[model samples]
Target chain A: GGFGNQGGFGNSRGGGAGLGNNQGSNMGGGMNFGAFSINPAMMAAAQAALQSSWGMMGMLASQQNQSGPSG
Target chain B: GGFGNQGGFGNSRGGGAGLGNNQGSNMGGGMNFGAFSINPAMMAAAQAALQSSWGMMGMLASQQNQSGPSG
Candidate 1:
């Protein structure tokens, strides 16, 4: 299970309970999304799913450009 | 167990592994990525992680504009 772009949000659609840190990705103390595959090929697929997830999650696109992963 | 942009790649980095299907996110079975949270705000953070993951995963950006999630 180390292939493809499954670094996506998998139906974690909460019931509008609360906000901030409940389901956030605070990696290396920064905002991060999706999974990182050694196989960069899967990155494309990962991005594919990402775009799709925006709508699926009913999420509006935002542009913060914050710090990413530490890698 | 959910929340946050931890829907990310995490430490799924393989050891020079193979390709396809191992870490893939197949929802509607086309080419999906990321998890969907009912919280749209998280989307921003999610996307944040997405952008960051590009470099973290050492993945080259691809432009296919394929289908997203099922919602």
Candidate 2:
């Protein structure tokens, strides 16, 4: 399913998920700091967590953009 | 399978074909002049050819879009 406009990040988001190659689209990639805003600690956590396996899977979208498909 | 950006055209193509229903998307619906830019004459002819029963089937995508299980 495609994510609505207010929440978007990856190219995959605006375009919607199920775009191709097993990608998913949702804001924040399933991590919710719902009550909190991005701070230094949150930023660092975001960066580190962004480097995890899930992050790589998320970045797989970039590979799709560069090498896999586009329009 | 998906089409590369040099030949980008339709939403279904970027998302990779087999998106849904029976619409296919790849750079102006299968008209090929082999690396020549998209020409106006070719475009008109493509437009005419694009209106076949098959083409109507593709516009059916709009109806499909209006109605479906959105997750």
TM-score of each prediction: 0.17, 0.14
What RMSD does each model have against the real structure? 19.8, 24.3
How would you encode candidate 2's per-residue C-alpha lDDT over B1-71 as one tens digit per residue? Answer: 12111211233334433332212222222222233232221112211221111221111111111111111
Over A1-71, each residue of candidate 2 has an lDDT whose tens digit, in order, gives 22111212223322433222222221222222233221111122211211111221112111111122112
Best by DockQ: 1
Across all models, the iRMS values in order are 19.8, 24.3
lDDT per residue as tens, model 1, B1-71: 11112234333333212212222222221122543222112223222324322232212222222222221
Instruction: Please report, as a residue range, the 10-residue window in candidate 2 chain A with the lowest summed lDDT.
Output: A56-65
The prediction achieving the highest lDDT against the true structure is 1
